[PDB]
Enzyme design. Structure first.
Site, mmCIF file in Angstrom:
data_model
loop_
_atom_site.group_PDB
_atom_site.id
_atom_site.type_symbol
_atom_site.label_atom_id
_atom_site.label_comp_id
_atom_site.label_asym_id
_atom_site.label_seq_id
_atom_site.Cartn_x
_atom_site.Cartn_y
_atom_site.Cartn_z
ATOM 1 N N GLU A 101 0.816 -1.210 0.000
ATOM 2 C CA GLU A 101 0.000 0.000 0.000
ATOM 3 C C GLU A 101 0.854 1.267 0.000
ATOM 4 O O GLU A 101 0.809 2.052 0.956
ATOM 5 C CB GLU A 101 -0.944 -0.010 1.212
ATOM 6 C CG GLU A 101 -1.775 -1.290 1.336
ATOM 7 C CD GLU A 101 -2.985 -1.159 2.274
ATOM 8 O OE1 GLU A 101 -3.044 -0.186 3.049
ATOM 9 O OE2 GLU A 101 -3.866 -2.044 2.240
ATOM 10 N N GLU B 124 -5.177 -8.969 0.558
ATOM 11 C CA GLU B 124 -5.728 -8.623 1.860
ATOM 12 C C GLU B 124 -7.237 -8.472 1.745
ATOM 13 O O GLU B 124 -7.726 -7.788 0.842
ATOM 14 C CB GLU B 124 -5.133 -7.314 2.386
ATOM 15 C CG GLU B 124 -3.756 -7.419 2.995
ATOM 16 C CD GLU B 124 -3.327 -6.111 3.641
ATOM 17 O OE1 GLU B 124 -4.225 -5.336 4.048
ATOM 18 O OE2 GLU B 124 -2.104 -5.855 3.727
HETATM 19 C C1 LIG Z 1 -7.265 -3.954 8.026
HETATM 20 N N1 LIG Z 1 -6.353 -2.782 7.791
HETATM 21 C C2 LIG Z 1 -6.987 -1.923 6.792
HETATM 22 C C3 LIG Z 1 -5.781 -1.181 6.051
HETATM 23 N N2 LIG Z 1 -5.807 -0.986 4.592
HETATM 24 C C4 LIG Z 1 -6.628 -0.198 3.870
HETATM 25 O O1 LIG Z 1 -7.474 0.443 4.513
HETATM 26 C C5 LIG Z 1 -6.609 0.004 2.341
HETATM 27 C C6 LIG Z 1 -7.850 -0.383 1.483
HETATM 28 C C7 LIG Z 1 -7.824 -1.438 0.549
HETATM 29 C C8 LIG Z 1 -8.960 -1.775 -0.222
HETATM 30 C C9 LIG Z 1 -10.188 -1.076 -0.100
HETATM 31 C C10 LIG Z 1 -10.242 -0.012 0.838
HETATM 32 C C11 LIG Z 1 -9.077 0.311 1.598
HETATM 33 N N3 LIG Z 1 -11.488 0.716 0.959
HETATM 34 C C12 LIG Z 1 -12.637 0.354 0.287
HETATM 35 O O2 LIG Z 1 -13.694 0.986 0.433
HETATM 36 C C13 LIG Z 1 -12.625 -0.880 -0.483
HETATM 37 O O3 LIG Z 1 -11.274 -1.396 -0.852
HETATM 38 C C14 LIG Z 1 -4.590 -2.081 6.490
HETATM 39 C C15 LIG Z 1 -5.174 -3.312 7.038
HETATM 40 C C16 LIG Z 1 -4.261 -4.145 7.921
HETATM 41 O O4 LIG Z 1 -3.684 -3.340 8.941
#
Ligand SMILES: CN1C[C@H](NC(=O)Cc2ccc3c(c2)NC(=O)CO3)C[C@H]1CO
Ligand SMILES: [Mg+2]
Length: 725
Positions: free
Chosen positions: A267, A517
């Site tokens: 990310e 993920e």
């Molecule tokens: C559980 N935590 C959450 C965080 N990563 C993200 O938040 C990035 C993300 C990816 C795909 C997505 C959205 C956000 N948002 C949408 O609405 C749909 O797809 C990191 C992860 C582990 O620590």
């Protein structure tokens, strides 16, 4: 599949997993599905330094220490095999292995923690012995733990001219350890999922601009004779390459047989790259929450100047403007002074900083973006174009991330010649067109996906909205993106995962897709299921958690039939602090929820306590699915309530089928056991073609290929007497 590798032209191991078509394939042409978990978020921080503890946080990292040993799995107390046995008994064949730049290079530049890489090798071998396929995740969050998340070693902040101890007063980063202040922190009040907004605060906005584009927007940031861009990218790439080389030189048996490839940097942040106007926060910035300074407002705060900023709430349809808020750093600046750079920065960690890298003052002002005397913004569209060619409007993915991936993938292939490139484009961006010169018919799209509404609100809502459709402006209004009811919501989420597949074939090529993920939060409704509220009522009722994960998991079924890795599995998860990271709680398992060879797990002759004790909503994440198939998977459907499982296979006359080449399907005891009070399946099975056979939690399905053309076969499974209790 070909008899030689599309990368090297050499013959391939018998365990080779092909990644040159829309599906993973073994050497016998069977389509493989890889499903499992990320192991593990516990590897984001060293031992005894969870996100909410400030004691020792700064001091240990300042001393160059970083003790991650026995994370994610303790190899000394015998717990590691139990955890892996549980995951295997849930039917998983995949692990996204988490490791951080910090854990490799915390002592200093080029001073690598070789003991910890040997530990990683020791863990990966147990994973191989338990039959898992692995791909490696170089992991970070908002750049580093010291900027609110995970990833890079502390000395990278000093390398960027930032004094870590002024981040809070400036609001350049929000640290769980220092919320709401470093003087009187109250970690438990840390707002839900606010850590992600660190990507849009000054520290990340600066550092990520350096990392991906220092040569373009910060040309005077010279360090060791290089722009900060090369300094940071070389050091990050060298570190990961150093781990791959070690594995290649000290444990080459792991490569391809177990470690099948490497993910790109996790990310990645975009910094200020592409910002069209530094004076506003674009409406397209999907995430806002809490005090949200605009870029220039954050820079003014970075110079110690007070600013009245807009605060944002997260409502049912997304962020909306709340009340305004005043941030007063009281003159404290973010930028390391020249004196402190000698004592704590360049002079301490061992680099030389260029004469034109102004210290103790804002580095963007130093580049003419704004004027400090008047506090006026001069070049609001500075990151919108190339200073050298204002006619070129920037695309972060095409112009900066892609170039990084090219250098990164080259190193990976240098030490792991047959590595699959798991390509992770930036969050909610489409990948770039990459050259087959670098992919070489051995790549996989590794996007992430979360049910965003469920994750931010920590609630399973009766409504939901199409995040990806909104981003792509599909709807006239955001209200037309809303769906009501389980059915429509589940169908909507399944359609969102379908876009990830469309991204791959349209852009990357005919390659597989794997959701690197995906998961849901368990700390829902103020932890009602942990017994925290309403006088303990609801403790142990994971109904809402089970429906949210069932909807996310079902989205990977249907016609998608996706590979994925659930986020996540944390051996040290607890109800009070969740995953011990920024208030996130996505672990499938927790000791707070409790009331052995591989061969025995394959046998099914284990205790049901292994597959249930400590789990949360196990009915949703442990599901039937086809691990290997003669033909192409066409549709998967699974229903918890009825236990009904239906799988359709498109079999082709040219497919290989015989006594040893067959379709293999995992049938979990969790849903199909006679009882969970040896363990055995108690199912009725209906197959349109061929014969079937059952042993343990494994269903084998022999059938002949069509004489010509292609036909679709089906197999249906359902527990006798309804569902279990
Ligand atoms: C559980 N935590 C959450 C965080 N990563 C993200 O938040 C990035 C993300 C990816 C795909 C997505 C959205 C956000 N948002 C949408 O609405 C749909 O797809 C990191 C992860 C582990 O620590
Ligand atoms: Mg040195």
């Amino acid at each position: 599949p070909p008899e030689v590798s599309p990368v090297t032209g050499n013959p391939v191991s018998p365990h080779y997993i092909h990644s040159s078509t829309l599906h993973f394939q073994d050497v016998n042409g069977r389509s493989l599905v890889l499903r499992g978990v990320n192991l593990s978020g516990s590897a984001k921080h060293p031992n005894n330094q969870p996100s909410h503890i400030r004691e020792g946080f700064w001091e240990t990292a300042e001393a160059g220490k970083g003790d991650f040993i026995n994370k994610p799995l303790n190899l000394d107390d015998g717990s590691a095999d139990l955890h892996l046995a549980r995951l295997k008994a849930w039917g998983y064949n995949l692990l996204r292995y988490v490791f951080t730049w910090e854990s490799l290079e915390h002592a200093g530049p080029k001073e690598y923690d070789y003991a910890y890489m040997d530990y990683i090798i020791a863990v990966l071998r147990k994973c191989k012995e338990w039959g898992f396929r692995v791909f490696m995740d170089p992991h970070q969050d908002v750049w580093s733990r010291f900027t609110g998340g995970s990833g890079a070693p502390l000395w990278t902040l000093y390398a960027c001219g930032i004094d870590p101890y002024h981040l809070t007063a400036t609001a350049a980063a929000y640290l769980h350890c220092e919320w709401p202040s470093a003087e009187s922190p109250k970690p438990q009040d840390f707002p839900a999922m606010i850590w992600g907004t660190n990507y849009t605060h000054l520290a990340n906005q600066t550092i990520w601009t350096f990392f991906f584009a220092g040569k373009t927007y910060a040309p005077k940031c010279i360090i060791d004779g290089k722009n900060i861009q090369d300094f940071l990218q070389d050091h990050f790439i060298d570190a990961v390459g150093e781990l791959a080389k070690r594995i290649a030189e000290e444990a080459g048996d792991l490569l391809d047989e177990c470690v099948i490839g490497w993910d790109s940097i996790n990310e990645p942040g975009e910094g200020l790259i592409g910002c069209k106007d530094l004076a506003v926060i674009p409406a397209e910035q999907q995430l806002k929450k809490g005090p949200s300074p605009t870029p220039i407002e954050g820079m003014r705060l970075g110079m110690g100047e007070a600013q009245d900023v807009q605060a944002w709430n997260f409502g049912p349809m997304g962020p909306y403007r709340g009340s305004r808020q005043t941030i007063d750093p009281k003159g404290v600046k973010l930028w390391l002074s020249k004196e402190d750079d000698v004592k704590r920065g360049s002079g301490k960690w061992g680099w030389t900083r260029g004469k034109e890298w102004a210290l103790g003052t804002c580095i963007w002002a130093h580049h003419g973006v704004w004027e400090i005397a008047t506090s006026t913004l001069l070049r609001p569209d500075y990151f919108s174009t190339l200073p050298t060619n204002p006619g070129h409007q920037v695309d972060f993915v095409d112009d900066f991330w892609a170039l990084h991936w090219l250098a990164y993938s080259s190193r990976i292939r240098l030490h792991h010649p047959e590595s699959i490139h798991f390509i992770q484009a930036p969050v909610l961006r489409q990948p770039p067109k990459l050259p087959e010169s670098f992919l070489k018919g051995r790549a996989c799209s590794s996007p992430h996906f979360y049910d965003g509404l469920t994750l931010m609100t920590k609630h399973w809502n009766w409504f939901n909205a199409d995040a990806i459709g909104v981003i792509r402006k599909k709807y006239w209004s955001i209200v037309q993106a809303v769906r009501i009811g389980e059915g429509p919501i589940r169908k909507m989420i399944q359609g969102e995962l379908a876009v990830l597949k469309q991204d791959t074939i349209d852009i990357l090529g005919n390659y597989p897709t794997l959701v690197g993920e995906i998961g849901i939060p368990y700390d829902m409704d103020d932890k009602k299921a942990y017994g925290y509220v309403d006088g303990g009522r609801g403790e142990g009722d994971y109904s809402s958690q089970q429906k949210a994960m069932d909807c996310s998991m079902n989205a990977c079924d249907g016609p998608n039939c996706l590979n994925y890795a659930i986020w996540n599995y944390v051996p040290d998860n607890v109800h009070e602090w969740g995953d011990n990271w920024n208030g996130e709680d996505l672990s499938l398992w927790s000791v707070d929820d409790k009331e052995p060879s591989p061969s025995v797990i394959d046998s099914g002759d284990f205790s049901p306590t292994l597959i249930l004790d400590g789990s949360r909503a196990v009915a949703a994440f442990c599901r039937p699915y086809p691990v290997a198939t003669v033909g192409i998977p066409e549709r998967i459907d699974f229903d918890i309530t009825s236990t009904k499982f239906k799988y359709a296979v498109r079999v082709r006359a040219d497919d290989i089928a015989n006594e040893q080449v067959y379709t293999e399907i995992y049938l979990p005891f969790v849903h199909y056991a006679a009882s969970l009070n040896q363990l055995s399946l108690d199912v009725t099975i209906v197959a349109s073609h061929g014969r079937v056979e059952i042993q343990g939690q494994t269903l084998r399905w022999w059938y002949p290929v069509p004489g010509t053309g292609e036909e679709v076969y089906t197999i249906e499974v359902q527990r006798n007497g309804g569902a279990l209790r």
